[PDB]
Every structure is written in C-alpha cells, then in structure tokens.
From a paper:
The crystal structure of BT0996-C with the N-terminal His-tag was determined at 1.65 Å resolution by molecular replacement using, as phasing model, the preliminary 2.3 Å resolution structure of the C-terminal His-tag construct, solved by Se-SAD. The final refined high-resolution structure contained one molecule of BT0996-C in the asymmetric unit, consisting of 122 amino acid residues of the wild-type protein and an additional nine residues of the N-terminal tag. BT0996-C displays a distorted β-sandwich, composed of two β-sheets connected by loops. β-Sheet A includes β-strands 1, 3, 4, 11, 6 and 9, whereas β-sheet B comprises β-strands 2, 5, 10, 7 and 8. The structural calcium ion, highly conserved in many lectins and CBM families, is positioned near β-1, β-11 strands and H1 helix. This metal ion is coordinated by Glu21 Oε1, Glu23 Oε1 and Oε2, Asp137 Oδ1, the backbone carbonyls of Asp137, Thr40, and one water molecule, in an octahedral geometry confirmed by the Check My Metal server. A striking feature of BT0996-C is its high content in positively charged residues (15 Lys, 2 His and 4 Arg), representing almost 20 % of the protein composition, resulting in a theoretical isoelectric point (pI) of 9.43. This feature confers a prominent broad positive patch to the electrostatic surface of the BT0996-C protein, which includes both β-sheets and the loops that connect them. Instead, in the 3D structure here reported, a 2-methyl-2,4-pentanediol (MPD) molecule present in the crystallisation solution could be modelled, establishing CH–π interactions to His36 and water-mediated hydrogen bonds to Gly133 O and Thr73 Oγ1 from β-sheets 3 and 4, near the loop region.
BT0996 protein acts in the initial stages of the RG-II depolymerisation, where its two catalytic modules remove the terminal monosaccharides from RG-II side chains A and B. BT0996 is modular and has three putative carbohydrate-binding modules (CBMs) for which the roles in the RG-II degradation are unknown. Here, we present the characterisation of the module at the C-terminal domain, which we designated BT0996-C. The high-resolution structure obtained by X-ray crystallography reveals that the protein displays a typical β-sandwich fold with structural similarity to CBMs assigned to families 6 and 35. In line with this, carbohydrate microarrays and microscale thermophoresis show the ability of BT0996-C to bind α1-4-linked polygalacturonic acid, and that electrostatic interactions are essential for the recognition of the anionic polysaccharide. The results support the hypothesis that BT0996-C may have evolved to potentiate the action of BT0996 catalytic modules on the complex structure of RG-II by binding to the polygalacturonic acid backbone sequence.
Residue numbers in the entry: 11 to 141
Amino acid sequence: SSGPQQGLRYEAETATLKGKFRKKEHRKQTGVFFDKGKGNSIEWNISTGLAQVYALRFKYMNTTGKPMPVLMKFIDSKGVVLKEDILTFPETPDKWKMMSTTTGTFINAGHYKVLLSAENMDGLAFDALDI
Ligand SMILES: [Ca+2]
Ligand SMILES: [Cl-]
Ligand SMILES: [Cl-]
C-alpha cells in the first residue's frame, strides 16, 4: 500500500549497468537486454522528496518462457540495505510489460539505489523504472 506515484521515469539504459548486456531498441523503446553470466545487475539511482512508502514499477520483458526470480535491494545513500526481496518477473511476449513492487518501508527524503541482480538474468530486458 504505497503512497501516490510521482510520475517520474528513470531509463534503464542510463542506469548503472554491470555484466553482459546490450542496449537495443524494441518497439520504439530503448532497453537494456541482459545475456548469460553470473555478474549482471542494473541499479537505478533515484532521489525522493516527501516521505512515504514508494511503489516501484519496472517496465521489462522476459523472453525466456518461464518466470524469472530477481533479487531487489533498496539501498540508502550510505549503503544500508533497507529492503531485500525476490521479485518474480513473469514471462512476457515480445512486448514490454510492467511489474510493480514497493519499498516495503517508509522512506524519508534522500538518495536511494534500486538494485536488481540474479545469478541468471539472461533473457530479461528493462526499459525503465517508474516511480
Ligand atoms: Ca528506456
Ligand atoms: Cl530474500
Ligand atoms: Cl511493446
């Protein structure tokens, strides 16, 4: 039960990217497409104002034919892990879809990191994070 959305988009392709991936356009959107390997991650850096629980909405594709578990960490500016959760991204057709979670905890104004990683991210693509 989050607070009101802010109407802000943070593009995946200008987030902090690690591992093996490609930036590609698909159906007019630019996304980060992850490949094989154990060291892949995407980390958005967001700055929040008024204090609330935040909904986090990921625009993504999962072209693998199976649900894909991904570890989410919500991290504060000093490296404190405020939330750790497995998100399961359902398989999608070759079209961008949305997956929502929350910060779980009430967060005050500050700079935060939304980190997604998994042992396997092959076949996941991310367009953006909306808050
Ligand atoms: Ca994008
Ligand atoms: Cl966990
Ligand atoms: Cl689409």
